[PDB]
Amino acid sequence: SLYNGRKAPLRLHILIVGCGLGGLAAAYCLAQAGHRVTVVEAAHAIGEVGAGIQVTPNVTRLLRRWGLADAIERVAVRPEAIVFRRYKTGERVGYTKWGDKMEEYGAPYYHIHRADFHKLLFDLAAPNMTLRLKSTVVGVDPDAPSLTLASGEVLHGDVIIGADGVKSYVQQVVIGRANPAQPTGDAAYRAIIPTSVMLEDPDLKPFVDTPEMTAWMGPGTHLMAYNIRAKQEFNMVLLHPDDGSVESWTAEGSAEKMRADFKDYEPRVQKLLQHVKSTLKWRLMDRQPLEKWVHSSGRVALLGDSCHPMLPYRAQGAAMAIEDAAVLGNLFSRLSHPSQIAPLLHAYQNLRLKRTADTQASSRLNQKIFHLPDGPAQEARDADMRAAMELEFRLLDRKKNMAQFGYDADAVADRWWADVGEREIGSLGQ
Ligand SMILES: Cc1cc2nc3c(=O)[nH]c(=O)nc-3n(C[C@H](O)[C@H](O)[C@H](O)COP(=O)(O)OP(=O)(O)OC[C@H]3O[C@@H](n4cnc5c(N)ncnc54)[C@H](O)[C@@H]3O)c2cc1C
Numbered sequence: 001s002l003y004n005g006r007k008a009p010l011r012l013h014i015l016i017v018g019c020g021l022g023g024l025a026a027a028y029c030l031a032q033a034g035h036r037v038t039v040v041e042a043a044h045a046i047g048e049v050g051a052g053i054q055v056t057p058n059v060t061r062l063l064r065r066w067g068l069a070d071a072i073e074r075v076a077v078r079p080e081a082i083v084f085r086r087y088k089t090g091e092r093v094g095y096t097k098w099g100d101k102m103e104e105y106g107a108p109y110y111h112i113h114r115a116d117f118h119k120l121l122f123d124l125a126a127p128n129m130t131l132r133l134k135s136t137v138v139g140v141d142p143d144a145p146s147l148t149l150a151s152g153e154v155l156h157g158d159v160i161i162g163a164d165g166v167k168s169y170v171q172q173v174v175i176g177r178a179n180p181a182q183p184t185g186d187a188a189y190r191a192i193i194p195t196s197v198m199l200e201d202p203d204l205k206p207f208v209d210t211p212e213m214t215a216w217m218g219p220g221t222h223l224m225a226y227n228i229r230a231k232q233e234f235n236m237v238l239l240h241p242d243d244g245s246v247e248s249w250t251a252e253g254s255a256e257k258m259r260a261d262f263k264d265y266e267p268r269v270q271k272l273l274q275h276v277k278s279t280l281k282w283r284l285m286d287r288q289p290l291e292k293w294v295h296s297s298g299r300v301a302l303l304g305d306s307c308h309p310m311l312p313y314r315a316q317g318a319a320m321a322i323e324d325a326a327v328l329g330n331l332f333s334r335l336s337h338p339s340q341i342a343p344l345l346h347a348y349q350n351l352r353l354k355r356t357a358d359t360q361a362s363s364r365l366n367q368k369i370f371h372l373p374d375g376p377a378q379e380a381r382d383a384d385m386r387a388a389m390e391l392e393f394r395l396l397d398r399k400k401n402m403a404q405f406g407y408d409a410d411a412v413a414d415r416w417w418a419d420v421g422e423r424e425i426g427s428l429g430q
Contacts, residue, residue: 019131025321030328030329050118051113061408079226102405113233160301166285166306180288198234219374308320315363324356334425
């Protein structure tokens with residue numbers, strides 16, 4: 001029971017465009033808040049798709065609140081540390097202890113396969129939503145409001161939530177255009193190998209025995225690797241200069257070109273990439289924060305990657321989409337009169353926008369540091385990492401980590417409601 005058992009005295013029909021991690025989180029939170037939810041999804045079925053997702057303590061805190069504590073512990077992995085390595089030799093130049101140290105933010109840091117994460121949120125939301133698959137939204141009347149599907153079917157609701165991802169259709173209706181996207185010059189390969197083949201190699205086995213997030217830093221390139229799916233699968237993300245790619249979750253890369261691009265990395269990376277049977281490739285595109293997330297009619301708003309997508313350096317996409325849902329559901333649990341619908345959507349945006357813009361920036365400002373060419377700049381980064389690492393080992397920015405990881409979406413919305421919203425929004429209609 002979320003919201004201390006409270007249900008909005010005014011029950012809405014809310015249409016959610018997109019059955020991704022955001023849309024499912026929104027469907028769960030808004031149904032719990034006392035609203036009728038329909039989720040409309042383009043995909044014909046939910047598939048075994050996607051790769052590793054970061055579940056930082058600020059996300060885990062909410063998933064535990066939603067009753068998922070055992071189910072996530074079962075399928076996700078708790079990384080013990082983040083380790084930075086020189087590409088060529090595998091020298092460990094950096095180390096930050098995670099594991100139990102992450103519990104000081106009030107919940108564990110998990111690594112999860114997107115499909116396992118999707119399944120957890122799907123099973124939560126499914127009993128309290130109507131899901132329409134094979135239903136591409138191709139039009140929005142933001143005044144009614146209503147949605148138009150590719151079939152021409154029109155769906156009516158009180159509120160439309162656009163959770164339709166990085167290439168949101170709803171975003172174009174809210175803002176009046178697609179948010180400009182600028183190529184960074186880089187692409188990412190994503191590839192998964194079974195950990196059974198690593199356990200068979202005495203040089204690779206320790207990567208399964210002691211689950212870490214390892215970043216090998218190279219000239220123009222990096223390889224980030226970690227266990228998912230209860231250490232049955234090893235997730236690898238490889239950043240490299242864009243030699244032709246598209247911004248799509250289904251676009252393929254050449255495993256042979258991937259191996260060629262990383263041929264100068266240490267022998268354990270050669271052995272890891274030898275097991276890659278296939279790889280998907282994504283063109284990195286930089287997007288700025290939106291000016292607003294709410295349409296001028298106050299009945300359509302955005303959630304998740306539709307309004308704050310970010311680069312894979314600090315992939316907090318899932319985190320920010322789930323936080324968005326928790327705050328939106330918290331505010332909507334308060335609704336008692338139609339005159340409050342717009343103010344509540346404005347409050348949602350007001351509580352979320354700067355935080356998510358700062359989180360996009362945190363990812364954006366990590367693009368060059370792991371890709372330095374060999375030389376003075378590279379040796380100074382390694383030296384700075386070593387200094388920090390040696391303190392970590394003697395025991396055997398933190399304030400930014402606390403601002404990200406210690407965040408409680410419900411606490412922020414409960415406090416705003418108590419200090420301001422009850423008086424300024426709750427009284428509307430009296
Ligand atoms: C198939 C898939 C695979 C992914 N794999 C990865 C990955 O490996 N690593 C990673 O970092 N991130 C991945 N992502 C993105 C990741 O889910 C997000 O960055 C974030 O975790 C959650 O954001 P979101 O729910 O706002 O958007 P998304 O997860 O992108 O979900 C948006 C949903 O909206 C649907 N949709 C889009 N347009 C319409 C429309 N017009 N009408 C109806 N439905 C529509 C899409 O089909 C999708 O299911 C993937 C997304 C998808 C859809």
